[PDB]
């Protein structure tokens, strides 16, 4: 009923005195098949639209000047709309799992307190806090090697402190050269030790490395491992090392590349959350996300004129909830406190009148979704993978897996052999840049330009490569894939007009939280310059 039938397409693409070509009848037969697939899965109907589209391209490619092409190109558009009609019309229950991830170190009390808000008002959801029991020391290894590399760099600035050369850019660049040397020293140590004794777990190699090379005490380390393991298990800990579909899957080596080699826990977590959606299904949430505020809680308080965006208004309300209900101790109030007396009292009045936390934060209840799709959060009108919904084994969850494989294949195939010739950071980067230029074309040049900062990720201002390799960009890839009947699209040019079809409902989340503004993996120019003055002031004063 949504898509044209055979007779409609036949009159659409009618050409007088022209033979019905075999490639044309193949489209008609396939479209007739599609309208009799009453009994089939959503995924089988989608695969059929893929065939129809593919047969239509074959026709257009065979008879490049055919009078039918204008109607077949409009038929192709109708296929894309029919993806969305198929998506919207056949919903399936979302598994009642809230999935969070905290890996690489001990879960913080602040993460717990956010998770508790979700747990408290979703008593019909199972809560998972995914952690890696083999890798509690990655955050200590990263912090130690960055501290060591900073110390070395600040000392090398001994008596050039007030020169113009020795600014924040000079610091982070020379510290990055030292980090690369150190990071490779560890990576080559991990690779050698794993090869020799494959029964070694990551933390066994990391703690030996920290005591050998950085004179850390193996007993504080062992006590930290014990403390960290007990804290997550007390708080819905779900060990990655018991995740068998993940461990024997296509991308587990990429997860360990980010975890062990890159010390990019956000990158590792980007990959794990795809395996979570594909193999288990449910709702994924970054630990800095809070539940959707009950739409009726503050209906009687007018947004003051001083508050000029929805983000600022949500932040006011979250701060108001936390100041008066104190659900999350130490939750800031610096924004709420600037509101007028009359408005502050209005928030206090409404919050004092509520007793049930489920009247403050909105329970998710029953969620349903297309078996085709992963839903994704929006921030400032662009997608962000900090919140996802997928039924187990969704078509998109598989497209996301292929996105990660292809992107890391281009990256690892290109940068790996350059890293292996054992030159320093600057030599490695210039050679990497030249290797990237040699494989660039119009289709992939955007991607190619965005992965040059890979070795800087976590250590240097505006190193945003993770977005491109494992984060929001793979979802733009997978949505483009679904809507163009393609796979592993590397040109992720797509309009929000299409992406809004996959939006995580704004009503089921609060993104404007205190922790969301403090990214754990990247930092901008201003943060780097603030870091530099504190690094210097501490090293000397």
Partner 1 sequence: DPPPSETHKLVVVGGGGVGKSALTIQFIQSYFVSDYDPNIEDSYTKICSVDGIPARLDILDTAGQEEFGAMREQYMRAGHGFLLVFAINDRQSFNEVGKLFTQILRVKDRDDFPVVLVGNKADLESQRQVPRSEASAFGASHHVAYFEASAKLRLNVDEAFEQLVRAVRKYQEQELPPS
Ligand X SMILES: Nc1nc2c(ncn2[C@@H]2O[C@H](COP(=O)(O)OP(=O)(O)O)[C@@H](O)[C@H]2O)c(=O)[nH]1
The reply to whether 453 sits near ligand UDP by the rule CB under 6 A is no
Q: How far apart are CA 228 and CA 137, in angstroms?
A: 10
Nearer Cβ to ligand UDP, position 288 or 314? Answer: 288
516 touches, from ligand X, Mn ion, ligand [N+], none (C-beta below 5 to 8 Å by class): Mn ion
The reply to whether 54 sits near ligand [N+] by the rule CB under 6 A is yes
Sequence-ordered list of residues with C-beta below 8 angstroms from that of 78, at least 6 positions apart, any chain: 3, 4
The reply to whether 315 sits near ligand [N+] by the rule CB under 6 A is no
Piece of 285-293, 301-309, 405-413, 478-486 that binds ligand UDP (CB under 6 A): 285-293
DSSP state of 485: T
Q: Is 516 annotated as ligand-binding?
A: yes
Structure-token pair, residue 147: 């501290």
Query: Which backbone phi and psi does 155 adopt, to 5 degrees?
Result: -65, -40
The reply to whether 379 sits near ligand UDP by the rule CB under 6 A is no
Least distance to ligand GLC from the beta carbon of 289, Å?
Answer: 9
Q: Is 288 annotated as ligand-binding?
A: yes
Q: At what angle do helices 168-196 and 138-155 cross, to 10 degrees?
A: 140
DSSP state of 4: -
Please count the other Cβ atoms lying within 10 Å of the Cβ belonging to residue 471. 22
Least distance to ligand GLC from the beta carbon of 377, Å?
Answer: 8
Query: Which backbone phi and psi does 513 adopt, to 5 degrees?
Result: -100, 165
The answer to whether residues 9 and 64 touch, using CB atoms and an 8 Å cutoff, is: no
Q: How far apart are CA 536 and CA 534, in angstroms?
A: 5
Using CA atoms, how far residue 160 sits from 82, 163, 535, in Å, is 66, 5, 15
371 touches, from ligand [N+], ligand GLC, ligand X, none (C-beta below 5 to 8 Å by class): ligand [N+]
Of 279, 284, 26, 259, whose CA–CA distance to 130 is shortest? 284
Q: Is 373 annotated as ligand-binding?
A: no
Piece of 13-21, 83-91, 97-105, 457-465 that binds partner 1 (CB under 8 A): 457-465
Nearer Cβ to ligand UDP, position 439 or 530? Answer: 530
Structure-token pair, residue 301: 């308080």
369 touches, from ligand GLC, ligand X, ligand UDP, none (C-beta below 5 to 8 Å by class): none
Nearer Cβ to partner 1, position 34 or 459? Answer: 459
The reply to whether 458 sits near partner 1 by the rule CB under 8 A is no
The reply to whether 516 sits near Mn ion by the rule CB under 5 A is yes
Burial class (CB in 10 A: 0-12, 13-18, 19+), 325: middle
270 touches, from partner 1, Mn ion, ligand GLC, none (C-beta below 5 to 8 Å by class): ligand GLC
Per-residue binding string, ligand X, 468-507, x by CB under 6 A, is ----------------------------------------
Q: In the sheet where 97-101 sits, what is the strand order?
A: 237-239, 126-131, 97-101, 282-285, 382-390, 375-379
The reply to whether 292 sits near partner 1 by the rule CB under 8 A is no
Q: How far apart are CA 386 and CA 381, in angstroms?
A: 14
As a 3-state breakdown, the chain gives helix, strand, coil percent values, each rounded to 5, of: 60, 10, 35
Least distance to ligand UDP from the beta carbon of 458, Å?
Answer: 10
**Residue 92's beta-bridge partner residues?**
369
Per-residue binding string, ligand UDP, 477-516, x by CB under 6 A, is ----------------------------------------
The answer to whether residues 411 and 451 touch, using CB atoms and an 8 Å cutoff, is: yes
Least distance to Mn ion from the beta carbon of 472, Å?
Answer: 11
The reply to whether 310 sits near ligand [N+] by the rule CB under 6 A is yes
Alpha carbon dihedral 44, 45, 49, 51, in 10-degree steps, equals 30
Q: Is the dihedral of CA 161, 162, 168, 170 positive or negative?
A: negative
Rg of the chain in Å (alpha carbons): 27
State the DSSP string of 422-459.
---HHHHHHHHHHHHHHH--TTTHHHHHHSTTGGGTTT
The reply to whether 363 sits near partner 1 by the rule CB under 8 A is no
Per-residue binding string, partner 1, 295-334, x by CB under 8 A, is --------------x-xx----------------------
Least distance to ligand [N+] from the beta carbon of 378, Å?
Answer: 8
Residue located via tokens 């129809």: 52
Nearer Cβ to partner 1, position 55 or 469? Answer: 469
Give residues 372-431 in contact with ligand [N+] (rule: CB under 6 A).
373, 390-391, 394
103 touches, from partner 1, Mn ion, ligand UDP, none (C-beta below 5 to 8 Å by class): ligand UDP
Q: At what angle do helices 168-196 and 525-539 cross, to 10 degrees?
A: 90
Least distance to ligand [N+] from the beta carbon of 400, Å?
Answer: 11
437 touches, from ligand [N+], Mn ion, partner 1, none (C-beta below 5 to 8 Å by class): partner 1
> Interface with partner 1 by CB under 8 A: which residues?
169, 173, 309, 311-312, 379-384, 386, 426, 429-430, 432-434, 436-437, 440, 442, 445-446, 448-450, 452-453, 461-464, 466-468, 471-473, 475-476, 492-497, 511-512, 516-517, 519, 521-522, 524-526
Known binding residues for Mg(2+) are 286, 288, 516
Known binding residues are 286, 288, 516
> Interface with Mn ion by CB under 5 A: which residues?
286, 288, 516
> Interface with ligand [N+] by CB under 6 A: which residues?
5-6, 31-32, 35, 51, 54-55, 310-311, 314, 369, 371, 373, 390-391, 394, 512
């Amino acid at each position: 009923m949504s898509l044209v039938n055979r007779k409609q397409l036949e009159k659409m693409a009618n050409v007088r005195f022209r033979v019905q070509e075999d490639e044309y009848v193949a489209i008609l037969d396939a479209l007739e098949e599609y309208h009799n697939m009453s009994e089939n899965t959503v995924v089988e109907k989608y695969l059929k639209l893929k065939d129809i589209n593919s047969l239509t391209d074959t026709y257009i490619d065979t008879y490049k000047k055919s009078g039918r092409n204008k109607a077949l190109k409009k038929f192709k558009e109708y296929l894309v709309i029919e993806i969305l009609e198929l998506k919207n019309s056949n919903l399936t229950p979302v598994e009642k799992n809230l999935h969070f991830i905290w890996i690489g170190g001990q879960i913080n009390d602040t993460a717990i307190n956010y998770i508790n808000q979700w747990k408290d008002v979703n008593s019909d959801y199972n809560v998972n806090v995914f952690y890696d029991s083999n890798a509690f020391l990655i955050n200590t290894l990263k912090k130690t090697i960055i501290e060591s590399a900073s110390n070395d760099t600040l000392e090398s600035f001994r008596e050039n402190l007030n020169d113009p050369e020795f600014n924040h850019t000079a610091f982070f660049r020379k510290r990055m050269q030292i980090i690369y040397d150190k990071q490779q020293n560890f990576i080559n140590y991990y690779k050698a030790q794993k090869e020799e004794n494959p029964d070694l777990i990551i933390d066994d190699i990391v703690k030996t490395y920290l005591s050998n090379e950085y004179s850390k005490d193996i007993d504080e380390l062992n006590a930290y491992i014990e403390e960290s393991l007990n804290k997550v298990t007390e708080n819905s800990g779900n060990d990655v090392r018991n995740f068998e579909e993940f461990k024997t899957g296509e991308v587990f080596n990429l997860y360990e590349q980010e975890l062990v080699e890159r010390w990019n826990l956000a990158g590792a977590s980007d990959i794990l959350r795809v395996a979570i959606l594909k193999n288990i299904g449910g709702v994924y949430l970054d630990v800095d996300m809070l539940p959707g505020i009950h739409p009726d809680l503050f209906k009687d308080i007018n947004k003051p004129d001083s508050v000029k965006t929805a983000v600022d208004w949500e932040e006011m309300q979250l701060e108001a909830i936390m100041k008066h209900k104190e659900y999350i101790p130490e939750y800031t109030s610096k924004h709420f406190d600037t509101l007028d007396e009359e408005v502050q009292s209005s928030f206090e009045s409404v919050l004092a009148s509520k007793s049930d936390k489920s009247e403050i934060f909105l329970p998710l209840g029953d969620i349903e979704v297309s078996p085709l799709e992963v839903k994704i959060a929006f921030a400032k009108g662009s997608i962000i993978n900090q919140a996802l919904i997928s039924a187990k084994d969704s078509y998109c969850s598989d497209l996301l897996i292929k996105q990660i494989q292809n992107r890391y294949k281009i990256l690892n195939d290109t940068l790996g052999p350059i890293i292996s010739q054992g030159n320093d950071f600057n030599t490695t980067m210039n050679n990497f840049g030249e290797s990237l230029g040699a494989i660039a074309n119009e289709e992939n040049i955007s991607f190619i330009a965005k992965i040059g900062s890979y070795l800087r990720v976590g250590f240097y201002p505006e190193a945003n490569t993770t977005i491109t390799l494992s984060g929001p960009t793979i979802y733009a890839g997978a949505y483009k894939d679904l809507l163009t009947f393609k796979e592993m699209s590397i040109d992720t040019s797509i309009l929000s007009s299409e992406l809004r079809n996959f939006e995580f409902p704004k009503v089921n989340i609060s993104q404007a939280t205190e922790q969301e503004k403090n990214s754990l993996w990247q930092f901008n120019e201003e943060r780097a310059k603030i870091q530099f003055e504190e690094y210097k002031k501490n090293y000397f004063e």
